[PDB]
Design a binder for this molecule. Structure first.
Ligand SMILES: Cn1cc(-c2ccnc(N)n2)c2ccccc21
Length: 330
């Protein structure tokens, strides 16, 4: 669809991203001096139409409450319909955090940048949580750099060139799944590797599922890879147990996902082929730390608090924003 023209002013020049919903494209704005915008073009399919309308209502609420994007939600500039596709025009951001890491060879972010990003993510999502919203689909693909310009230098340690962002500021995108406290809560939310245990066990969810997703994001920024390299629910829970310890009994008793359990324990054979795979790729959380200096301990203390199994016990984002991991910012 490059070359197509929307609402007689936006000419498509590139595809920025793709998803269940349709695509996001970069357009030239022929009515505003040729400067560039992003446009989300949604498939003409009911479920995606309805999510897009929902996104528009969230974005209108967020833009009215925070018109300057102090809390780092992507700014919608306008919206319209075009050949029965809903189109949402946004400020043009840079690469997703995912795409940046990928382009840098899966080299993790330096801890000082991770601190700034985590703070901004927590601040943004906490704004949502303060307004009776849960995002539900937090992942590196939905955290974008405001500007993804970088300087480069040779790193002798690893013996290759690496990219460092000039400005690591981020924004949070994709409010298509975002859910108000009083609305219908989908059965399954999140992308699997960022999905909380209460979701996997069908116990019900709310704001704390976002906090679990954030904990997973932060591990990935730190390591350059997921600690949950899985596409199977039961295996995912086995990975959780290796990394975090046994699931709480009360969650196991409450769940109706009985296929995953035997007696009141995860139905998992450690000596099976899948068991070896889990045992090889997963280990207690603090063993992933790359240094023992206090800054790293504090990141991991926050991460462990975000990956608390019981959503009632998990750290809230308001509590996270005061964590000592974040003092070097002040
Ligand atoms: C690449 N990319 C993806 C999204 C985006 C994706 C899903 N939902 C939403 N709302 N936005 C996006 C937004 C602005 C600029 C680039 C963008």
């Amino acid at each position: 669809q490059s070359g197509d023209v929307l609402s007689a002013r936006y000419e498509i020049v590139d595809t920025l991203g793709e998803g269940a919903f349709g695509k996001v494209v970069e357009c030239i704005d022929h009515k505003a001096g040729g400067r560039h915008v992003a446009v989300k073009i949604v498939k003409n399919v009911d479920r995606y139409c309805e999510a897009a309308r929902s996104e528009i209502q969230v974005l209108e609420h967020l833009n009215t409450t925070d018109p300057n994007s102090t809390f780092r939600c992507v700014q919608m500039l306008e919206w319209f319909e075009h050949h029965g596709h809903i189109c949402i025009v946004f400020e043009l951001l840079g690469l997703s955090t995912y795409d940046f890491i990928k382009e840098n060879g899966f080299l993790p972010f330096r801890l000082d940048h991770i601190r700034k990003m985590a703070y901004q993510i927590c601040k943004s999502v906490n704004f949502l949580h303060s307004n009776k919203l849960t995002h539900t689909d937090l992942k590196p693909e939905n955290i974008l750099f405001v500007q993804s310009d970088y300087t480069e230098a040779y790193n002798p340690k690893i013996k290759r060139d690496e990219r460092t962002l000039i400005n690591p500021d981020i924004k949070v995108v994709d409010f298509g799944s975002a859910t108000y406290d009083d609305e219908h809560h989908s059965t399954l939310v999140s992308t699997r590797h960022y999905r909380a245990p209460e979701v996997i066990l069908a116990l019900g969810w709310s704001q704390p599922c976002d906090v679990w997703s954030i904990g997973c994001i932060l591990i990935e920024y730190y390591l350059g890879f997921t600690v949950f390299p899985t596409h199977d629910s039961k295996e995912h829970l086995a990975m959780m147990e290796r990394i975090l310890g046994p699931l709480p009994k009360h969650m196991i008793q409450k769940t109706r996902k009985r296929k995953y359990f035997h007696h009141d324990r995860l139905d998992w054979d450690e000596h099976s082929s899948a068991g070896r795979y889990v045992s090889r790729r997963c280990k207690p959380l603090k063993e992933f730390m790359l240094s023992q200096d206090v800054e790293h301990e504090r990141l991991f203390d926050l991460i462990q608090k975000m990956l608390e199994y019981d959503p009632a016990k998990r750290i809230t984002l308001r509590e996270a924003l005061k964590h000592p991991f974040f003092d070097l910012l002040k």
